[PDB]
Design a protein around this nucleic acid. Structure first.
Lengths: 251, 106, 204, 193, 130, 173
RNA sequence: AUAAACAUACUUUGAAUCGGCCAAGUCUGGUAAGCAGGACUGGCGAUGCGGGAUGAACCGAACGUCGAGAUAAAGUGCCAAA
RNA sequence: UGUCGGCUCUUCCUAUCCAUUUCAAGCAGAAUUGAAAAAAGGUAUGAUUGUUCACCAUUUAAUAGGGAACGUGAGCUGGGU
RNA sequence: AAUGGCUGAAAGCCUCUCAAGCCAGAAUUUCGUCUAGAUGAAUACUUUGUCUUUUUCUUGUUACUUUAGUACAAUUGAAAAUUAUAUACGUUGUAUUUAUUAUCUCGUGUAUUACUCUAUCAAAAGGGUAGUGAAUACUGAGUUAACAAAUUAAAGCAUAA
């Protein structure tokens, strides 16, 4: 029979299944749609949450009844030391999605970046990018690099720069860097690669990526809780006190 | 060296919707598209030559054959019936067989 | 012997169902098929007519678990594969082996773009259809239901058409030169003995 | 019943040049060009010289022919002929649609862009929302007198639809349309020349 | 405009049946699907009969002064007057018919000569082009 | 379809044995033709097989099966509502050929099976007496039409390959 | 007229069985029922085989173990032989 | 095969109560009435009764009708039977 | 979508179309966006460059070790579009498997190639240039043939990542 009284379902079906992620860093599923009528610029960054505090801000909107002395609001602090750009990769649009064509890296790579490619650094020989760095200035290897640049300019649509953090500037005990690919939105692929090539080995500060009073999107992994019952996970009604075998479950 | 045969496809056995009679095998000879071209092939030789990966310690041949004869037409599309000394293995369905030019009548 | 070569079918200007029926039978006969441009096939009915059929198809879905339910592929290459898979034996090694020798693509990928294309006369859209009957390209229907890569294919096909335009123009130049050279050999006096044999049987 | 042959013809005047390429007629006249595609798989369009008058001479005509075909299909022969006849008329003496603005209490002010590719209807029944209504390519709006406008163009289908877009953007909603007689209406449709 | 019409007098070629690849002349149109072909039985050997339009093909020739229900005596005179036999054998369809008849009586030894000879000529022509 | 000429006489008290019944019956064979003849006698003259003798049953062959004639058929058929009389016209070279067309045409346009139709009479009308809306157009002297969209013809089933090579094309024909 | 000699007429002793069900160019009560009850016949029960995708009853046809052929109901785009 | 109702929870039907888009009126405006597309989203709080049902007092944009072994007892309760 | 329209026949007029062709129109659908996600791709390092099976070391993997067997550079496979297709012709009438004149040697240079290889410029090309060889045509001459013959299996752990 029909349920006697109607009520919205508890929990969203848009977040099913509720599977916990495996990596602390969260990868953005998308980037803002590219426009070819502007200078190349980065469309993302990466920072560490420090905490939260509160501020009093002066209301500038007109036709509002808010107090003239300020409004109390919360603010989250995100410490964002400069990143180091250590390469770039070109993506091509095929009939099965973007496909990375080639990746070009810089001559000098920090050990923070190298730590990503091992699982026991203290036992590894730490020979990451050794052949790439040692033969960087060879005549044969240089010619290969020029082809990679020209291949991207010919058969690629999306250019992203592989930037990594400097964990020595934050109070975290972690020493391995955090790597993020930041898409370049702007001019044609000719001037996109030129911009990416200019940024090799350099440092990108967050002021160059974001403006002032700019609304941004944030992707991160929430706070873990472990095994949880129905009441906390979804928000069902607790059963009456008289119930045999327990109260905090779906009848 | 030279090709003295016509490839025929082992389509299956003479059957019904829910039955099957593995004594008569059905073949589709390449180039025969109608039952009026079948009379030439009635009585010719057919061989199912298959390869077996023998070991170094066995004298059994790596290449074996099963021989038969095309006996009658089957339908109006140039399908034929063939009877073999040993019924073809159903694992050989869809494989290629050899239709020889002998016993000749020319 | 063994059929190692691959039959390439240009699915342009064909009917999805009648192509599948002919392909399905020959997959069971040991042949190897590769249907290119599986997005240019035609089906009976207008776009609104086809969308109503698609929404009915989308309805079928396991109520208790939609992940277990019927999977509704939207890429036209997967619309052809579903149609072919329905005409093949189910739940036996013969059916799976037959389907293993089939590939659809939305265009002409690198290896199959320089191969001899074939056609299925029974499945041609100019024979089985009244010309006034309205049809729908599988690529156009796929976009209406959520196939994202319709315009990527339209870009790739455009460059293949222009690349095949210059190759054909060069080949037509060489062939004309070779054709006229052969005429001089045919008209040459030293080759009189060999020419008469060809003329006797009509080859010349 | 099925007709063995249904045919129609359009007389090409002097200042009109027509070229056909697989049911794709391009007509050029003193006022410009007009290209249309007639994608019907059962019509044969070809230009010829025919005597269409009772006792007149030969003249260049475009013959739209469809052979054996039912009455559902056969209706399209005169449809295509009318389209080609309209195309010839447009490039010789273009069309114009004189629309008039009707208001009861609230005056309506029309703001037309400088080039004429857009209009702007203001204060329609006192509404604060301002309607824009873009115009099709080849159609130009202008103001004739008071509360009267006219859309100029060469293709009737472009001029007529653009005129209807103006009217369809100023519909009274949730009110008695027999009492609130407001909007922009097409007074008449005529030729420029 | 269309070039070849199904009419009275139009010369047609039979594509199937016992009289395949034999010329014929239409003398009566029963309906949109059937015609009466009387390709003179004294000339091409096609008897007066009713055929379906799916078995014939139109040629580019029309016998002049052929009226509907033309008899065999009068039709034979007009067939030779226009010399359809000579004209048909000069067209691409006619040459393909003679070629088919040439190759059917062309034995294994003959296949050897032509295949060997043609390979040399085709290879020689390819060498000639710079 | 074949046409037969059947005659018989009745030898009993009711009918004098000097009156002979004739008919021309269209039937696939003579056995079916006789059955139609006996039912006409039984339902119109109270004549039964057990009290009558058949005399002749010979086929009637077309005299000149090479002349195109406009045949007119007067028939009566039984529908869901009642019984109606129809007059259809066909263009064929044989009388049995026209009747074959009539049976097929009636079974499609009216969904009437063969065992509901009685062919009252079949005659030949003039060229201008054809009133069929479609058939009226092909009776003129100067009928001319281009058969378009021709599917290419196959010489025999020998060349009916399943998969072809190259592109396909129709024929303006 | 047609058929009938492993035809015909039996005699004695005895087993199980008398819960039935279905079909219909049939009937009665009931608004009707895959309802209740009957006349005639054929079936299922006791019965597998080929076809109707599947089915106690529908259609063909009833069964020792096999080979080769012509078939029946019914089918011949693929699953599926044509 | 654990036999009513309520509590908890999910899904499904449309013969739709609200919200969205339209047509009609004996539609001047407001409030309404009849109908179409549409089932993605909502559809309440209490007094009395074990009640389903019902009847009152409110509130709401609306407080629509139904199915799922007359949904749901190794889910509860045991008021009724 | 329901609905309101544009042009417009059928049906000389009318008509939103139980005709062809378009426009506006929903808490609608699809992209875009959010979550889970299959076969995948790029890069870094370790290797290997004809190949596996069975044993065997390791927590496990790859490389690796031993005894044997197998192949050895060179003719494969592309017009597009339309089908009432500008004209003309209808070029008829067997898709893949399946189109090489047996073998080896001797002889002259030229010419050709979606042929192999090398060097270079390029390049997600059946690419360009130069050279080399192969096959073929000009176009040979000879020798020989008879009876026989013409898809990986078994064993290990020193070293390296």
């Amino acid at each position: 029979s029909h349920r006697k009284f109607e009520a919205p379902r508890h929990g969203s079906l848009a977040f099913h299944p509720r599977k916990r992620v495996h990596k602390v860093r969260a990868t953005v599923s998308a980037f803002p749609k590219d426009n070819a009528a502007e200078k190349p610029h980065l469309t993302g960054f990466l920072g560490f949450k420090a905490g939260m505090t509160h501020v009093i801000r002066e209301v500038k909107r007109t036709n509002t009844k808010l107090p003239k002395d300020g409004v109390l609001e919360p603010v989250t602090i995100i410490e964002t030391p400069p990143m180091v750009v250590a390469g770039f990769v070109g993506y091509k649009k095929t009939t099965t999605g973007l496909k990375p064509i080639t990746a070009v890296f810089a001559e000098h790579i920090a050990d923070e970046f190298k730590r990503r490619y091992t699982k026991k650094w203290y036992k590894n020989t730490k020979n990451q990018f050794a052949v790439h760095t040692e033969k960087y200035n060879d005549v044969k290897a240089k010619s290969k690099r020029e082809r990679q640049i020209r291949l991207i300019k010919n058969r690629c649509d999306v250019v992203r720069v592989i930037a990594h953090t400097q964990m020595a500037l934050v109070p975290l005990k972690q020493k391995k860097a955090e790597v993020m690919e930041i898409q370049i939105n702007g001019g044609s692929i000719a001037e996109k690669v030129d911009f990416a090539v200019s940024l090799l080995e350099k440092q990108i500060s967050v002021n160059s990526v974001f403006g002032t009073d700019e609304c941004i999107d944030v992707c991160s992994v929430t706070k873990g809780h472990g095994y949880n019952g129905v009441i906390k996970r979804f928000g069902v009604r607790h059963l009456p006190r008289k119930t045999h075998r327990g109260l905090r479950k779906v009848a | 060296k030279c090709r003295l045969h016509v490839n025929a496809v082992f389509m299956g056995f003479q059957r019904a919707q829910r039955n099957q009679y593995p004594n008569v095998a059905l073949l589709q000879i390449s180039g025969v598209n109608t039952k009026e071209d079948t009379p030439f092939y009635i009585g010719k030789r057919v061989a199912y030559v298959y390869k077996v990966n023998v070991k170094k310690g066995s004298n059994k041949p790596a290449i074996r054959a099963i021989f038969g004869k095309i006996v009658a037409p089957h339908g109006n599309h140039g399908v034929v019936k063939a009877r073999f000394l040993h019924n073809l293995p159903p694992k050989a369905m869809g494989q290629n067989l050899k239709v020889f030019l002998y016993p000749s009548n020319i | 012997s063994t059929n190692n070569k691959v039959t390439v079918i240009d699915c342009h200007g064909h009917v999805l169902g009648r192509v599948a029926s002919v392909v399905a039978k020959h997959l069971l006969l040991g042949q190897k098929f590769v249907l290119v441009r599986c997005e240019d096939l035609q089906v009976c009915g207008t776009l609104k007519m086809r969308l109503v059929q698609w929404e009915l198809y989308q309805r079928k879905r396991v109520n208790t678990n939609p992940t277990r339910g019927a999977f509704h592929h939207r890429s036209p290459a997967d619309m052809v594969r579903k149609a072919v898979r329905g005409m093949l034996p189910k739940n036996n090694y013969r059916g799976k082996l037959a389907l293993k020798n089939l590939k659809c693509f939305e265009g002409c990928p690198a290896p199959y773009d320089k191969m001899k294309k074939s056609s299925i006369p029974e499945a041609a859209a100019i024979y089985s259809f009244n010309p006034t009957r309205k049809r729908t390209l599988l690529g156009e229907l796929g976009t209406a239901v959520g196939w994202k890569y319709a315009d990527v294919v339209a870009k790739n096909e455009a460059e293949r058409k222009e690349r095949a335009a210059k190759w054909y123009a060069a080949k037509q130049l060489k062939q004309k030169a070779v054709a006229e050279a052969k005429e001089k050999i045919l008209a040459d006096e030293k080759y009189k003995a060999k020419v008469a044999i060809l003329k006797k049987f009509g080859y010349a | 019943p099925r007709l063995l042959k249904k045919t129609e013809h359009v007389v090409i005047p002097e200042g009109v040049n027509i070229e056909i390429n697989r049911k794709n007629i391009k007509v050029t006249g003193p006022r410009g060009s007009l290209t249309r595609e007639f994608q019907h798989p059962k019509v044969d369009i070809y230009a010829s010289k025919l005597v269409v008058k009772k006792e007149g001479p030969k003249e260049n005509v475009v013959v739209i022919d469809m052979w054996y075909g039912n009455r559902r299909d056969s209706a399209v022969v005169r449809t295509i002929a009318s389209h080609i006849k309209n195309m010839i008329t447009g490039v010789t003496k273009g069309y114009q649609y004189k629309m008039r603005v009707v208001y009861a209490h609230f005056p309506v002010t029309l703001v037309i862009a400088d080039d004429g590719k857009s209009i702007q209807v203001q204060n329609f029944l006192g509404e604060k929302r301002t309607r824009h209504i873009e115009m099709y390519d080849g159609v130009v709006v202008k103001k004739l007198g008071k509360d009267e406008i006219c859309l100029e163009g060469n293709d009737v289908e472009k001029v007529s639809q653009s005129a209807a877009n103006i009217h369809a953007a100023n519909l009274v909603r949730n009110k008695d349309i027999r009492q609130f007689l407001d909007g922009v209406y097409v007074s008449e449709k005529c030729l420029i020349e | 405009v269309f070039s070849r019409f199904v009419e009275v007098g139009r010369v047609v070629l039979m594509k199937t049946g016992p009289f395949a690849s034999k010329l014929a002349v239409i003398v009566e149109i029963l309906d949109h699907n059937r015609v009466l072909v009387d390709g003179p039985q004294a000339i091409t050997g096609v008897p007066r009969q009713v055929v379906n339009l799916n078995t014939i093909s139109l040629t580019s020739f029309v016998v002049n002064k052929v009226t509907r229900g033309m008899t065999h005596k009068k039709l034979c005179l007009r067939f030779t007057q226009d010399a359809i036999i000579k004209r048909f054998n000069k067209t691409a369809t006619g040459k393909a018919i003679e070629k088919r008849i040439l190759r059917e009586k062309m034995t294994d030894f003959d296949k050897f000569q032509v295949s060997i000879i043609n390979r040399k000529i085709n290879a020689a022509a390819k060498i000639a082009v710079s | 379809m074949k046409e037969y000429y059947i005659t018989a006489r009745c030898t009993d008290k009711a009918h004098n044995p000097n009156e002979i019944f004739r008919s021309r019956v269209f039937a696939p064979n003579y056995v079916v033709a006789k059955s139609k003849f006996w039912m006409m006698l039984k339902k119109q003259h109270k004549v039964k097989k057990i009290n009558a003798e058949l005399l002749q049953c010979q086929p009637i062959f077309e005299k000149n099966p090479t002349v195109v004639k406009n045949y007119q058929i007067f028939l009566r058929y039984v529908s869901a509502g009642g019984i109606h009389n129809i007059t259809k016209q066909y263009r064929d070279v044989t009388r049995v050929g026209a009747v074959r067309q009539m049976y097929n045409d009636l079974a499609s346009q009216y969904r009437t099976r063969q065992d509901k139709i009685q062919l009252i009479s079949i005659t030949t009308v003039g060229d201008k007496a054809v009133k069929n809306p479609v058939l009226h157009q092909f009776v003129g002297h100067h009928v001319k039409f281009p058969m378009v969209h021709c599917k290419p013809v196959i010489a025999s089933k020998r060349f009916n390959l399943p998969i072809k090579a190259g592109k396909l094309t129709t024929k303006l024909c």
